[PDB]
Amino acid sequence: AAPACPRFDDPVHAAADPRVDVERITPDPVWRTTCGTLYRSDSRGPAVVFEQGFLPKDVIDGQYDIESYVLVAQPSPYVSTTYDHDLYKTWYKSGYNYYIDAPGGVDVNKTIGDRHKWADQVEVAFPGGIRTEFVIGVCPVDKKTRTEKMSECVGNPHYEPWH
């Protein structure tokens, strides 16, 4: 039987940009307390992501309201991930399925409900993004079949297991 997950005191321990202001998050965030693998579709290549982590577009002046950010894709302090390994299949054009093992994140559907138009994305929004140490690796995606090119997956040399 699997054990329970470590719980960090800092809700944005994972942040690649610690300037994120947690008190500006609206509505009141429901933080993810599980620690399973999460995923992110991204067209940016692993040489970049493994060096930088996932940095958010705008931690200072971006859109801190999660419902707004989910509905209308504005520069924000958040990096979006999903609980769903297979969500990459519904992404048009996104070259890679990144694998993430990071503490925390805001559980979108627990925070804004599961009846909004994108509830099927089962999103976890990371305020301040995600340091490279929490990015496990990546698999490229074959666009025409919407499948992972599993012999071309790559592990992140900077990944640091923590549980």
Residue numbers in the entry: 38 to 200
Q: What text appears in the publication on this structure?
A:
Three residues (Trp128, Trp155, and Gln158) bridge the NAD+ and DNA substrates and these were studied and compared to the Scabin WT enzyme. Herein, the fourth-member of this proposed Scabin-NAD+-DNA bridge, Asn110, was investigated with the N110A variant. In Scabin, the Asn to Ala substitution does not perturb enzyme interaction with the NAD+ substrate, since the Michaelis-Menten constant of the N110A variant, KM(εNAD+)N110A = 66 ± 12 μM, is nearly identical to the WT value—KM(εNAD+)WT = 68 ± 3 μM. In Scabin, the Asn to Ala substitution modestly reduces the interaction with ds-DNA, since the dissociation constant of the N110A variant, KD(21bp-DNA)N110A = 82 ± 5 μM, is higher than the KD of the WT toxin of KD(21bp-DNA) = 51 ± 4 μM. The small effect of substitution with Ala on DNA-binding affinity (1.5×) may reflect the small contribution of the Asn110 H-bond to the binding energy. Notably, replacement of Asn110 with Ala severely compromised the enzyme’s ability to transfer ADP-ribose to ss-DNA, making Asn110 an important DNA-transferase residue in Scabin and the fourth member of the Scabin-NAD+-DNA bridge. Given its conservation among the Pierisin family, Asn110 is the new catalytic cornerstone for DNA substrate modification. All the structures were of high quality, ranging from 1.5 to 1.75 Å.
